[PDB]
Design a protein around this motif. Structure first.
Motif, PDB file in Angstrom:
ATOM      1  N   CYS E   7      10.582  -5.522  -2.401  1.00  0.00           N
ATOM      2  CA  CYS E   7       9.329  -5.711  -1.691  1.00  0.00           C
ATOM      3  C   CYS E   7       8.565  -4.406  -1.560  1.00  0.00           C
ATOM      4  CB  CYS E   7       9.591  -6.314  -0.317  1.00  0.00           C
ATOM      5  SG  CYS E   7      10.710  -7.714  -0.351  1.00  0.00           S
ATOM      6  N   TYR E   8       9.262  -3.283  -1.485  1.00  0.00           N
ATOM      7  CA  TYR E   8       8.619  -1.987  -1.332  1.00  0.00           C
ATOM      8  C   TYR E   8       8.980  -1.055  -2.475  1.00  0.00           C
ATOM      9  CZ  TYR E   8       8.503  -3.919   3.389  1.00  0.00           C
ATOM     10  OH  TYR E   8       8.360  -4.742   4.477  1.00  0.00           O
ATOM     11  N   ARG E   9       9.235  -1.613  -3.653  1.00  0.00           N
ATOM     12  CA  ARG E   9       9.545  -0.782  -4.805  1.00  0.00           C
ATOM     13  C   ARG E   9       8.375   0.068  -5.267  1.00  0.00           C
ATOM     14  NH1 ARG E   9      12.808  -2.843 -10.257  1.00  0.00           N
ATOM     15  NH2 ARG E   9      13.371  -0.743 -10.969  1.00  0.00           N
ATOM     16  N   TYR E  10       7.143  -0.327  -4.975  1.00  0.00           N
ATOM     17  CA  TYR E  10       5.984   0.288  -5.598  1.00  0.00           C
ATOM     18  C   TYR E  10       5.150   1.069  -4.595  1.00  0.00           C
ATOM     19  CZ  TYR E  10       7.100  -2.457  -9.656  1.00  0.00           C
ATOM     20  OH  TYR E  10       7.748  -2.987 -10.747  1.00  0.00           O
ATOM     21  N   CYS E  11       4.491   2.113  -5.101  1.00  0.00           N
ATOM     22  CA  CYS E  11       3.579   2.939  -4.313  1.00  0.00           C
ATOM     23  C   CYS E  11       2.202   2.278  -4.297  1.00  0.00           C
ATOM     24  CB  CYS E  11       3.507   4.347  -4.884  1.00  0.00           C
ATOM     25  SG  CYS E  11       5.089   5.062  -5.350  1.00  0.00           S
ATOM     26  N   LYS E  12       2.118   1.174  -3.567  1.00  0.00           N
ATOM     27  CA  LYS E  12       0.886   0.409  -3.490  1.00  0.00           C
ATOM     28  C   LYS E  12      -0.001   0.831  -2.332  1.00  0.00           C
ATOM     29  CE  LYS E  12       1.385  -3.978  -4.885  1.00  0.00           C
ATOM     30  NZ  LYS E  12       1.884  -5.370  -4.989  1.00  0.00           N
ATOM     31  N   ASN E  13       0.380   1.860  -1.583  1.00  0.00           N
ATOM     32  CA  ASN E  13      -0.381   2.284  -0.421  1.00  0.00           C
ATOM     33  C   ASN E  13      -0.560   3.791  -0.430  1.00  0.00           C
ATOM     34  OD1 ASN E  13      -0.873  -0.224   0.731  1.00  0.00           O
ATOM     35  ND2 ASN E  13       1.003  -0.183   1.959  1.00  0.00           N
ATOM     36  N   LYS E  14      -1.600   4.238   0.262  1.00  0.00           N
ATOM     37  CA  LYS E  14      -1.784   5.656   0.482  1.00  0.00           C
ATOM     38  C   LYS E  14      -0.638   6.181   1.339  1.00  0.00           C
ATOM     39  CE  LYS E  14      -6.717   6.346   0.069  1.00  0.00           C
ATOM     40  NZ  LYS E  14      -6.776   5.158  -0.811  1.00  0.00           N
ATOM     41  N   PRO E  15      -0.319   7.469   1.232  1.00  0.00           N
ATOM     42  CA  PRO E  15       0.771   8.023   2.038  1.00  0.00           C
ATOM     43  C   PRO E  15       0.546   7.803   3.525  1.00  0.00           C
ATOM     44  CG  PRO E  15       0.198   9.538   0.317  1.00  0.00           C
ATOM     45  CD  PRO E  15      -0.809   8.436   0.240  1.00  0.00           C
ATOM     46  N   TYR E  16       1.624   7.445   4.211  1.00  0.00           N
ATOM     47  CA  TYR E  16       1.595   7.079   5.625  1.00  0.00           C
ATOM     48  C   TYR E  16       2.688   7.846   6.353  1.00  0.00           C
ATOM     49  CZ  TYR E  16       0.384   4.007   9.482  1.00  0.00           C
ATOM     50  OH  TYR E  16      -0.077   3.507  10.673  1.00  0.00           O
ATOM     51  N   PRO E  17       2.533   9.155   6.507  1.00  0.00           N
ATOM     52  CA  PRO E  17       3.582   9.944   7.146  1.00  0.00           C
ATOM     53  C   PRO E  17       3.596   9.738   8.648  1.00  0.00           C
ATOM     54  CG  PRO E  17       1.738  11.337   6.722  1.00  0.00           C
ATOM     55  CD  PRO E  17       1.360   9.983   6.187  1.00  0.00           C
TER      56      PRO E  17
END
Ligand SMILES: [Mg+2]
Ligand SMILES: [Mg+2]
Ligand SMILES: [Mg+2]
Ligand SMILES: [Zn+2]
Lengths: 52, 134, 161, 190, 205, 196
Positions: E7-17
RNA sequence: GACCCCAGAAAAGGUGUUGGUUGAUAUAGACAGCAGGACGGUGGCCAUGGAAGUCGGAAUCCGCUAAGGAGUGUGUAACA
């Protein structure tokens, strides 16, 4: 009351063999890879267990 | 044949042992020494090693006379109460003396190696005493 | 015979290890067929025998009776080779002719038993008649009409009580 | 990678006559005739000598799979030579734990009956391949001799007997009953 | 309990530190990033081996912890607890949100923080192991085992640089000999030939 | 280290071939390491024994052949498991002392027996628990004086045939002497001569 | 198996075959088979109920050597 000379002969065909871990096939003791299509000829083999 | 075949070896030493060890277990082979025999055998074999102390015995139809082979750990722990090359040098005189050797100097090399239970570095580049022993 | 001797050896080693010596207060306890302290047969079929019967009836075939049967039982059992062709007991498994000699126990105890078993079990009527006449076996009435293993039980029960 | 040529040579013994009818090899010897056609393999078979009588199998432009057929053909021909010179004798020792196995040889050794395998009432009936003769030994207690010229047929008959004697629903490591091929050899031992 | 990694394999979002706009982030699974003999000098371990990733993807903190432990057990069993140093060069600085469904629907769909993943690029090193030269086989086997805890494809590289430092192994020896590097800790201090002369007087003395 | 060890073998063989003008080529049978230790210690006074690859022997010989010709006579004799024994003592005395030290080799299981051995009928002295082996081999035996006793002499193995594990272990337990053998001289070489 | 969208697939395996990379052994005799040997201090030290190479914690030496590990396994309660 099997004499040991015949025990070895019977064990050669019945016991002393290798078994594929994935499909349980009965292979010759020096086999490295399984001979059967359904297991991908995988080289995961274990000796057939003894009775002792 | 000395009336008995008693060339068997025994590996008891230190504490008395007696029936706690396999002295009565191997006793019925001769049946003569028994509980007196292992008592006196241990009384003689108390020293010459407080370890397992493998030894051989000779039967005189009632008793036992013991010979104690020069085992490595046996003589090392017995002499123990550092390199101490002098004591092994004198201790190779009464040795079993075969060791599959060609020279006597190699014998002290072999036992200065087996005493590693470091003294390996003298054996590695030994240059003095390889002729001194014989 | 080999299996019989295996059983004898196993019993003998049992009593040797777990008993007292031959010099013991009980004495010699190891069982020997020549001593007649081991028997054979089958209790289910009602027949059995020992080394004494065959030796006694062969002596009668051939005070003094006890001596004869006693020293004949030693030839009855053992690694002794008897030639039916020779008619005299031998202590060599090879004849001067080089032919192998069956041992005495199988030759003159087991041979008649095997022969009567095969004749009765394979229904060889003339064979059983000849065997009865040679062995002077006394059958009774109601036994003369049966066949197979019950006839075997009858003949063996009368011959070897 | 197509190797230009792969060739292998087999020497024919003096008392053996080999004839090539296309890819059909006919091997004739003191024990008779063995015939076998290798028409499923595309090779170049030829007879070379007059006293040596060499037989060459050639395969041109063979890739890895068919490069292995050359030794297969040579070994089969050598088997034919062995069969017609010395014959094949398979000695099988019938082993049983408790129940003795009654092996009865029927008409001219072409039929084998296994009676008391594991002490049952069903009688196994095994028909030997044609030209294969069965026998019950005399120098051995429980032994079967299978003699023939075609090694294929002899060993297949032996396998027929062995797989007729099969234990079911049991720990086969325990129940070791059956007839197994103790050894594989020849007649006349020459 | 945790959603599958696919479900979260991909970098589909901007960085969210984890910052002042993303509060209440749960702590990551991985906490120790250097294991083995961390204290060994640079010259002790002249071999460095890296697990270079091939997928521009996200690697979960739990997966990083599991792979680290998988490498640690094998390396300890093969080369003892004093013969290797492991450094996991990825930190789980990205926060992944989850929209739990118990308002209902996609209304107000923004999700609360759930876990932390590390965004990794093609050619980026995930893990590095430094060790003695003859343990190259053991290092390659350990990283080979550790690959199985990550979704994408990774490659084992035997780095040319001496240990963990940024200089080649063949030049490291004479560089230290001619004093362009001074060892300290697990790395070295590069000494440029410009600056005060008093530093150069501390050297060569 | 393999190359250095081969080089060491070369220097060793050339030095000893130069040193000893009298060398006998000896065939090593099924001889054990302990047998070899005994042989080396027996010959430690006078002789020295070397063995290795025949190809290495022949190559070193051919290399040194220009320095010492007539060593080419040994070249078509380095075959099979053989080797060199260097001596300076007389032929019949060295031969005598080599035939004198032949260990009574135990019957190793699985090997061919060169000797026909028949065991006698005697008080074995074994405990009455080793009888199972006598039962397995097919010997009928009885307990006499509280120990195993065999009624008749019986052969066990013929000549030139394989031995069995049970047959061998019975002989080891009885501690009787089976077939015995050792290294045997194939040929001799006395300063450029060949003899039988 | 058979063509952008597109109508279906993954990690992981294969002694099926092909190509490629890196390394190694070898006419001083590769490799694989068949055949020998596979030793002595030493039944090495702690460890124990028994662990003699092979349950484990540590050490990894020597001589004979052509080589033999105080041991890769099977096995014994330990041996064998
Ligand atoms: Mg072949
Ligand atoms: Mg069942
Ligand atoms: Mg997005
Ligand atoms: Zn399979």
């Amino acid at each position: 009351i099997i004499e040991p000379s015949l025990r070895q002969l019977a064990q050669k065909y019945n016991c002393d063999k290798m078994i594929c871990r994935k499909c349980y096939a009965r292979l010759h003791p020096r086999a490295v890879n399984c001979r059967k299509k359904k297991c991908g000829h995988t080289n995961n083999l274990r000796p057939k267990k003894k009775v002792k | 044949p000395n009336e008995i075949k008693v060339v068997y070896l025994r590996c008891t030493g230190g504490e008395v042992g007696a029936t706690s060890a396999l002295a009565p277990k191997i006793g019925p082979l001769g049946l003569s020494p028994k509980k007196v025999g292992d008592d006196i055998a241990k009384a003689t074999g108390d020293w010459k090693g407080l370890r397992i102390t493998v030894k051989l015995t000779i039967q005189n139809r009632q008793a036992q006379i013991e010979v104690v082979p020069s085992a490595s750990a046996l003589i090392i722990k017995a002499l123990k109460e550092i390199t101490f090359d002098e004591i092994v040098n004198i201790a190779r005189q009464m040795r079993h003396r075969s060791l599959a050797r060609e020279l006597s100097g190699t014998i002290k090399e072999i036992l200065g190696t087996a005493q590693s239970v470091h003294p390996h570095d003298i054996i590695d580049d030994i240059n003095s005493g390889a002729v001194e022993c014989p | 015979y080999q299996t019989f001797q295996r059983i004898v050896e196993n019993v003998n080693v049992i009593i040797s290890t777990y008993g007292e010596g031959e010099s013991g207060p009980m004495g010699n306890i190891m069982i020997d067929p020549v001593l007649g302290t081991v028997g054979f047969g089958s209790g289910l079929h009602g027949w059995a025998f020992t080394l004494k019967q065959f030796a006694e009836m062969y002596v009668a075939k051939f005070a003094e009776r006890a001596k004869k049967v006693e020293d004949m039982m030693k030839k009855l059992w053992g690694d002794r080779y008897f030639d039916p062709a020779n008619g005299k007991f031998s202590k060599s498994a090879t004849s001067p002719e080089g032919k192998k000699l069956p041992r005495t126990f199988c030759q003159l105890i087991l041979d008649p038993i095997f022969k009567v078993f095969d004749a009765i079990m394979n229904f060889k009527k003339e064979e059983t008649a000849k065997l009865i006449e040679k062995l002077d076996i006394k059958l009774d009435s109601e036994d003369k009409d049966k066949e197979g293993k019950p006839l075997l039980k009858a003949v063996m029960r009368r011959w070897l009580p | 990678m197509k190797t230009i040529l792969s060739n292998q040579t087999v020497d024919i013994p003096e008392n053996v006559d080999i004839t090539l009818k296309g890819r059909t090899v006919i091997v004739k010897g003191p024990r008779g005739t063995l015939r076998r056609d290798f028409n499923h393999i595309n090779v170049e078979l030829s007879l070379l000598g007059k006293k040596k009588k060499r037989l060459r199998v050639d395969k041109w432009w063979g890739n890895r799979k068919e490069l292995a057929t050359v030794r297969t053909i040579c070994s089969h021909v050598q088997n034919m030579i062995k069969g017609v010179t010395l014959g094949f004798r398979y000695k099988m020792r019938s082993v049983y734990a408790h129940f003795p196995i009654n092996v009865v040889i029927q008409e001219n050794g072409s039929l084998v009956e296994i009676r008391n395998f594991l002490g049952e009432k069903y009688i196994r009936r095994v028909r030997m391949r044609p030209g294969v003769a069965c026998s019950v030994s005399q120098a051995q207690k429980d032994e079967l001799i299978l003699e023939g010229n075609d090694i294929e047929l002899v060993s297949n008959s032996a396998a027929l007997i062995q797989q007729a004697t099969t234990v079911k629903n049991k720990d086969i490591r325990k129940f070791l009953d059956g007839i197994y091929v103790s050894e594989k050899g020849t007649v006349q031992q020459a | 309990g945790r959603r599958p990694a696919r479900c979260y394999r991909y970098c589909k979002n901007k960085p969210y530190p984890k910052s002042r706009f993303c509060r209440g982030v749960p702590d990551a699974k991985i906490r120790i990033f250097d294991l083995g003999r961390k204290k060994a000098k640079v010259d002790e371990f002249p071999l460095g081996g890296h697990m270079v990733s091939d997928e521009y993807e996200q690697l979960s903190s739990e997966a990083l912890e599991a792979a680290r432990i998988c490498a640690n057990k094998y390396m300890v069993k093969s080369c003892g607890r004093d013969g290797f140093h492991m450094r996991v060069r990825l930190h789980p600085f990205h926060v992944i949100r989850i929209n739990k469904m118990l308002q209902t629907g996609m209304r107000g769909a923004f999700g609360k923080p759930q876990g932390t993943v590390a965004r990794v690029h093609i050619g980026q090193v995930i893990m590095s192991i430094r060790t003695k030269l003859q343990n190259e086989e053991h290092v390659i086997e350990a990283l080979r085992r550790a690959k199985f805890k990550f979704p994408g494809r990774q490659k084992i590289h035997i780095s040319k640089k001496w240990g963990f430092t940024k200089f080649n192994a063949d030049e490291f020896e004479d560089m230290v000999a001619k004093k362009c590097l001074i060892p300290d800790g697990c790395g070295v201090k590069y000494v440029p030939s410009h600056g005060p002369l008093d530093k150069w007087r501390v050297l060569h003395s | 280290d393999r190359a250095t060890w081969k080089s060491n073998y070369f220097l060793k063989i050339i030095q000893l071939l130069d040193d000893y003008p009298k060398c006998f080529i000896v065939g090593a049978d099924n001889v054990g390491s302990k047998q070899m230790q005994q042989i080396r210690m027996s010959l430690r006074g006078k002789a020295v024994v070397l063995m290795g690859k025949n190809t290495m022997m022949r190559k070193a010989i051919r290399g040194h052949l220009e320095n010492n010709p007539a060593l080419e006579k040994l070249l078509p004799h380095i075959r099979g498991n053989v080797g060199f024994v260097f001596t300076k003592e007389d032929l019949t005395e060295i031969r005598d002392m080599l035939l004198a030290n032949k260990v009574p080799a135990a019957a190793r299981a699985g090997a061919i027996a060169p000797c026909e051995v028949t065991v006698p009928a005697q008080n074995t002295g074994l405990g009455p628990e080793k009888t199972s082996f006598f039962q397995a081999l097919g010997i009928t035996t009885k307990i006499s004086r509280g120990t195993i006793e065999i009624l008749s002499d019986v052969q066990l193995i013929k000549t030139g045939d394989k031995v069995g594990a049970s047959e061998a272990t019975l002989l080891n337990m009885l501690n009787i002497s089976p077939f015995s053998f050792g290294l045997v001289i194939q040929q001799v070489f006395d300063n450029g001569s060949i003899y039988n």
